[PDB]
Amino acid sequence: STLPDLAEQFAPPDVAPPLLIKLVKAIEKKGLECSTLYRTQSSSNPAELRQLLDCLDLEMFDVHVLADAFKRYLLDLPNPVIPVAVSSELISLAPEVQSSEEYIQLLKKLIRSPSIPHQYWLTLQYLLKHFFKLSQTSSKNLLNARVLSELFSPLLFRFPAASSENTEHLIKIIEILISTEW
Amino acid sequence: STLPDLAEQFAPPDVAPPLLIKLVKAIEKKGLECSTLYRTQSSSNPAELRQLLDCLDLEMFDVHVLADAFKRYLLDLPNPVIPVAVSSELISLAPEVQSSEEYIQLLKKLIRSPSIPHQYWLTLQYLLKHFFKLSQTSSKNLLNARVLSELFSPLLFRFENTEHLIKIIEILISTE
């Protein structure tokens, strides 16, 4: 649990944590068309994956190890990419305020709060771009935006919560944000 | 004001915001012996000072304008160098605590909290180093740790109930 806060790992004008960029670039180089990328576990345990998140070129590793280390990274951030402040608010929204557009508007307003370092929103945007690029070779890797949201929303929000029509709505906006990256 | 959070202006391994470093270096080059540094209002208004903080060599500017822009910078940070949570805790202990060394140990403990980006403490240390350097020519600029603490504690904490905070800064300047 020695991964520094996102706000300490980089600062503007950099667009993302340098370790995260290395992971994403290696994964895209070696696994863009992999039909089980992020949907199978590798043999490495969390301690070994954490050991990798310190030291070599990440392209030297097995792609399934890199993919697991990507998840491990999202899980080990001291605060999640989408801070609990933001998700606590989004979950509290009523059924009458049910437009995905409104949920997205609120997520951007809350995460861009000056009470939240810009690094959180920057990292989320970088991850969305990766997820969008993956979904554009769906014909080969079988990943659409919705499945990528179902796989990664629990790692982005890190929020235990019964399956509400609120939680469906958070998966839905991530789904929309992946698809609408350009 | 569009000044970004301390945590957005730099990240480890850099030791301080690059704009703050530029200000400090220019002020120390041109004003180390100035008997009125940081105690005189210059002719510029906050908008003009912000224009200078929003961007070329800062040495071209009048030193009193640099000193004003340094204060403007500290005032315009979206969150103060010493976060409000930290200062609120130190203030609420005020009648029950009074060991100064305890206040200092606590200030450091609170500002190094994992919930607070390391940039806040890094920036505070950079500021303390500058304040200490000034105090080493106090015979000429008249800025000793106590005067520096009275001038800048209100900008660092962003605030009677406060005298123990001023003393913390005074001691932290002296022991650099």
Residue numbers in the entry:
A (entry chain A): 113 to 167, 172 to 298
B (entry chain B): 113 to 167, 172 to 275, 281 to 297
What text appears in the publication on this structure?
The N-terminal domains of p85α include an SH3 domain, capable of binding to proline-rich sequences, and a BH (breakpoint cluster region homology) domain. The BH domain can bind to and regulate several GTPases including Rab5, Rac1 and Cdc42. In addition, the p85α BH domain, either alone or together with the SH3 domain, can bind to and positively regulate PTEN activity. The p85α BH domain also exhibits Rab5 GAP activity to stimulate Rab5-mediated GTP hydrolysis required to inactivate Rab5-mediated protein trafficking functions.
To determine if the patient-derived p85α BH domain mutations impacted the overall folded structure of the BH domain, several of these BH domain mutants were crystalized and their structures were determined using X-ray crystallography. X-ray diffraction data collection and structure refinement statistics for bovine p85α (105–319) mutants (E137K, E217K, R262T, E297K) are provided in Supplementary Table S1. In contrast, several of the p85α mutants (E137K, K288Q, E297K) showed near wild type binding to PTEN, and either had enhanced (K288Q) or reduced (E297K, E137K) ability to stimulate PTEN lipid phosphatase activity. Three BH domain mutants, I177N, E217K and E297K, all showed significantly increased Rab5-GAP activity, whereas the E137K mutant had reduced activity. The location of cancer patient-derived p85α BH mutations with significant impacts on Rab5 binding (I177, E217) and/or regulation (E137, I177, E217, E297) are shown in the modeled p85α BH domain: Rab5 complex. These mutation sites are located in regions of the p85α BH domain, well away from the Rab5 binding pocket. Further, crystal structure determinations for several of these mutant BH domains indicated that no major structural alterations were present. No significant differences in protein flexibility were observed for any of the mutant proteins, suggesting that the mutations did not alter the rigidity of the domain.
